[PDB]
Amino acid sequence: MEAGITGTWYNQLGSTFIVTAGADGALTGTYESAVGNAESRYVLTGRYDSAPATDGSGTALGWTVAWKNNYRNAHSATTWSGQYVGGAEARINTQWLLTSGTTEANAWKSTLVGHDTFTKVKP
Template sequence: MDLFLLFIALSVSLTTITAHQESNSLKDLLSSGKSNRATNAACSDISGNWYNQHGSEIIFTPGAKSSLSGTFASTVSLYKNKRPTADPVNGKLVGYLQRDGSFGFAVIWDNASNQTTAYSGNCYPDENGEILIAAWHLAEKQHSIGDAWKGFRSGQDIFTRRKRLHHFS
């Protein structure tokens, strides 16, 4: 559990940094003028299926006291090429959802025992329901402490409840 909390803390820090690097289109998407009350109502339950811009799928299952569990099927390789793949990399997730729609979770990958990814983000209402915007931080154990710096990657995903069609080559 301590490792989980560490990853969530790192991920929250990355979300703050990433917030300053948002593109204009993302800022336009989020500046819909909806109140916090609308955000709270629309985003109080994020259970179910969510899909990101790469076609990866998260299935959130709500638990007691705002906890989340579920599965993550990533269509992006966790390895060097980072290209979408038709065979997803699967993982189990555990995390928490706050009443205001902010959330954090960590994924332990089944196919890559030396990698863990932490996500933190926020839920926003949009004209089609809700949208999740999250920063992620992947940590991969390296063979030596001198190479530890090579084991970290960060990014951002946008999840919707609508599955998107993707072509894999």
């Protein structure tokens, strides 16, 4: 139902996040590269607060991408957790966790942490 969220978003690197915000709170779409060829496209699914507070607070949301498609398998998954802030300069501020499948011994280097900011305007 969140038209505010539904659409195309771009992060600082040029990656494109295309999402549809369902009235039920579902997020569905695809994540791809700057040179968005099919080989760089991956499916995403997530959830968002479909009834946010009206006091000016952002809209909490999160989504996951498993890095496997018909062209590649990076044996990993990334989750983005953050909030949508609407307005003239709408943005989705997030923090992410990228976990790679590792052997038990290598579990110490299994999870990278970072952050991304998405906007409606191409970088």
